[PDB]
Amino acid sequence: PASTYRLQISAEFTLFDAARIVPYLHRLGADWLYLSPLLESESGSSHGYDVVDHSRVDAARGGPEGLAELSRAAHERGMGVVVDIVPNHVGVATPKANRWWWDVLARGQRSEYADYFDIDWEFGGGRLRLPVLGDGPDELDALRVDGDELVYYEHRFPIAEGTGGGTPREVHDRQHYELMSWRRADHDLNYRRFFAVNTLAAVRVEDPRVFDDTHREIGRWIAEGLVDGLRVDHPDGLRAPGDYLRRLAELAQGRPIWVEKIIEGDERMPPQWPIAGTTGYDALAGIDRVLVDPAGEHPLTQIVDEAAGSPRRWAELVPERKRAVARGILNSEIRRVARELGEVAGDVEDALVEIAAALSVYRSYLPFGREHLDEAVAAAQAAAPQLEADLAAVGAALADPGNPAALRFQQTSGMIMAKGVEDNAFYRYPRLTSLTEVGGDPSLFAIDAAAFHAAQRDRAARLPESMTTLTTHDTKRSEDTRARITALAEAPERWRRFLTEVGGLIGTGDRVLENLIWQAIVGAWPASRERLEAYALKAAREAGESTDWIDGDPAFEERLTRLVTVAVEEPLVHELLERLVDELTAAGYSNGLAAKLLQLLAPGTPDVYQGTERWDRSLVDPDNRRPVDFAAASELLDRLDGGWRPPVDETGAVKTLVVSRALRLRRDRPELFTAYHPVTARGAQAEHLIGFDRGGAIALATRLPLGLAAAGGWGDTVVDVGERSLRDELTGREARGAARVAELFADYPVALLVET
């Protein structure tokens, strides 16, 4: 595909609703639709990752008739369809809705589905532990019997055959499941789950029986020509992702497969994987970092370190926070690997925690990635010399793929990375929160144009079909929120002054968190009090420093809610905020356009999240899944195609112009995309030009717009565009040879030159 356009399908936006906006998406220039998970999922699921019935398309989403209509609308226009599929786990929030899980609760190990799940029956004393009770004492007094079902408030469970008797507690003691406090999931869970979400139970898709049953309807989509590609959710939780992908590629009949897989730095995936590439976070990281002014690193870091009283060091934060999740909410997983190892040493658990903390990647794929494991063991031995011998012993066992503990550990270290780093350490390291993003290393503050270009060349050389992305349903902050936040690296003294002035009026007791919160408010502005308050509570709990998800601090949380209320409604704070936003608005627009144009023309397959053809100033899930006004966007595009040339403003029309012209170009004139050459400027402001030539199309953008403005604009600066005449797709303006950047960017901070 020339591009993909991601749609959140749900009961609020069904496959039939999607089919009705297919014409608009074709008009916009989208090539393939990228659909969220479609198999039958938990009633009311807005996301579809909690599958309950693999046999059919989810009825709330339109069912098989909806998929047939959507696929027909797209294919009759020459468009394609790639579907998000979820192989690792199923939804068990409502046990009755999941007939496989219900059967295991009713029959235990005699169930035909018992080995569809990953259950440590022996650790459970022969019972499957369900962490659904409240933490209060005497909680099973609420347990009642109703027919052949045990009931705990709204939860219902099967009473095994012939186990009915007298007293709910008595009946409960003979079941193949054991209801227990939700708190016991940290250490006593005996089934594999997705991260620490107890209502998502893993399925052993490495078993061909289970692959067949969970993929039969997906396979019908391929076989009957309804879908043209697949996106694999969370392959790093699978026991054998290489074998999984090999089986899927045959099921997909050689159609493209992308994997949601987080890359650390210059890590490479196993080359044998029959995939088109990733969903694009590795691309996101390079695009954001070429727009960060590297001179901001030290000042923005000092703002955090002074607020915190001791330096926030990413080299300390990552191992510490990974250690903490491995000893806390993910300890059940750690203990299970240690049971599988046996007493290969004392302190097996402690060795595992140290090795996971030191691991530099999400996971190995042994024998691939063995070097990452060896480095982690050596690093752990340096960090915990008292454990040197145990780390040696445990590391040697973890290095053998014929060792089941080694494979379970590969299924665990990525959970520890995601929950320790992305969902915790990120929120403790806010010197520039646009860099704390899925797939990013926030200690890598900026990259220069040369490094940016090398990143693009690498993708062109090894992953030419891989996705690039700037916003997804899982990003911490959407692309235009980050675009404005990134402008803070050009004005660190102005940011320090803002925090000082606004901090003279309101505060929470956590000045480090307030820096993170104010960046989000400034980047999302304007945003409702309700959205900002919801964001602030979530970010504070992710950080876990002044409140958390388990035992929060309500007094602190109300200081946080009040800070948000004051930002929106108190005259002086509100004015200080609006003034700063005004100062940063042009720069944020410039950065947003630069990121969007560079991403859409870069090597790979650009993905476009729903609605991001206009400004998207969303925050974290669920704020980045608000409903999209396709009608408004269609009208904007209609005016652009009517010849209207917009100013750069809050309507986002200039962004719809950039997105539509770039998508259409990639889709309808693919002969213009044959190579990748950096385009560098000459003159006083040359460093502010970032651009490249794909063959017959040149992407040109601005970086560091506040510095450019302060310097007086472009001045004498020129780009040599070639001995060829080219025309700007966004303005009609022509350029040949040495073109003044002040003319190329006379209307927009961005230009799309097409050879003539």
User: What totals of helices (H) and strands (E) does the chain contain, helices first?
Assistant: 27, 25
Eight-class DSSP state of 159: P
CA 697 to CA 665: how far, in whole Å?
Answer: 9
Per DSSP bridges, beta strands 155-158 and 177-181 are unpaired
CA distances from 554 to 183, 337, 509, 715 (A): 19, 36, 13, 55
Indicate the burial class of 562 (C-beta count within 10 angstroms; 0-12, 13-18, 19 or more): middle
CA–CA gap between residue 172 and residue 75 (Å, rounded): 54
DSSP lists the bridge partners of residue 682 as 718
485 closest CA partner among 438, 507, 447, 517:
517
Which run of H or of E encompasses 122? none
Dihedral in degrees, nearest 10, Cα atoms 440, 444, 446, 450: -90
Sequence-distant (≥ 6) Cβ neighbours of residue 555 within 8 angstroms: none
SS3 at position 319 = helix
Distances in Å between the Cα of 279 and the Cα atoms of 234, 475, 593, 609 are 11, 12, 21, 11
- Rounded CA separation 270/12 (Å): 38
* DSSP state string for 706-749: HHHHHTTSSTT-EEEEEEEEEEETTT--EEEEEEEHHHHTSS-S
Environment class of 78 (CB within 10 Å of its CB; exposed 0-12, middle 13-18, buried 19+)? exposed
Instruction: Report how far residue 445's alpha carbon sits from residue 434's, in angstroms, rounded to the nearest whole number.
Output: 10
CATH assignment of the domain containing 156 = 3.30.1590.10
- For 358, residues 6+ apart whose C-beta sits below 8 A from its C-beta are 319, 375, 376, 377, 379, 380, 383
Q: Is residue 263 within 8 Å of 269, Cβ to Cβ?
A: yes
* Neighbouring residues of 451: CB distance < 8 A, sequence distance ≥ 6: 286, 289, 290
Q: Exposed, middle or buried, 333 (CB in 10 Å: 0-12/13-18/19+)?
A: buried
Are 661 and 641 within 8 A, CB to CB? no
What is the experimental resolution, given in Å to one decimal place? 2.5
Which residue range is the domain that position 107 belongs to?
95-202
Q: By C-alpha distance, which of 207, 205, 212 is closest to 251?
A: 212
Cis amide linkage into residue 137, ω under 30° from 0: no
Q: Rounded to whole angstroms, how far apart are CA atoms 107 and 117? A: 14
Alpha helices in 525-629 (DSSP H): 529-543, 554-569, 571-601
Element (H, E) at 129: strand 128-133
511-524 and 529-543 are packed helices; what angle lies between their axes, rounded to 10 degrees?
Answer: 140
- How many angstroms separate the CA atoms of 114 and 371, rounded? 36
Q: Are 191 and 120 in contact (CB under 8 A)?
A: yes
Cα(117)–Cα(557) distance, rounded to whole angstroms? 39
Round to whole Å and give the CA distance between 369 and 387: 23
Which three-class secondary structure state does DSSP give residue 83?
strand
| CATH number of the structural domain spanning residue 559 | 1.10.10.470
Any bridge partners for residue 258, and if so which? 231, 277
Three-state SS letters, 610-656: CCCCCCCCCCCCCHHHCCCCHHHHHHHHHHHHCCCCCCCCCCCHHHH
Strand partners, 608: 5
Cα–Cα distance for residue pair 322/359, rounded to 1 Å: 10
Q: Three-state SS across 53-69?
A: EEEEECCCCCHHHHHHH
CA–CA gap between residue 201 and residue 185 (Å, rounded) = 13
Distance, in Å, from the CA atom of 604 to the CA atom of 543, rounded to the nearest integer, reads 34
Token duo for residue 15? 């496959």
Lay out the sheet containing 605-609: strands in order across: 277-278, 257-259, 229-232, 80-85, 32-35, 4-7, 605-609, 467-468
Is-contact 233 260, C-beta < 8 A? yes
- Bridge-partner residues for 561, per DSSP? none
Tokens 């509100």 sit on residue: 574
Per the CB < 8 A criterion, the answer to whether 331 and 186 are in contact is yes
Phi, psi of 453 (to 5 degrees): -65, -40
* φ, ψ dihedrals at 434, nearest 5°: -65, -20
Chain-centre distance of CA 551, in angstroms?
26
CA dist., res. 253 & res. 234, Å (int): 21
Cα gap 375→355, rounded to integer Å: 9
Q: Which of 87, 47, 35, 83 is nearest to 235 (CA)?
A: 87
C-alpha to C-alpha distance for 717 and 299, rounded to whole angstroms: 29
Contact 407, 239 (CB under 8 A): yes
Q: Dihedral sign, CA of 456, 462, 468, 474?
A: negative
| C-alpha torsion sign, points 439, 444, 449, 451 | negative
Contacts of 271 (CB under 8 A, 6+ apart): none
What are the C-alpha distances in Å from 720 to residues 449, 453, 688, 731?
Answer: 17, 17, 15, 19
Residue of 87, 92, 8 whose CA lies nearest to 42: 92
Are 235 and 75 in contact by the 8 Å Cβ rule? The answer is no
R_g (Cα) of the chain, nearest Å: 27
Burial of 307 (0-12, 13-18, 19+ CB in 10 A): middle
With b for 16 or more beta-carbon neighbours within 10 A and e for fewer, the 336-367 pattern comes to bbbebbeebbebbbbbbbbbbbbbebbbbbbe
* Pairwise CA distance, residues 440 & 412, whole Å: 20
| H or E, element range at 237 | none
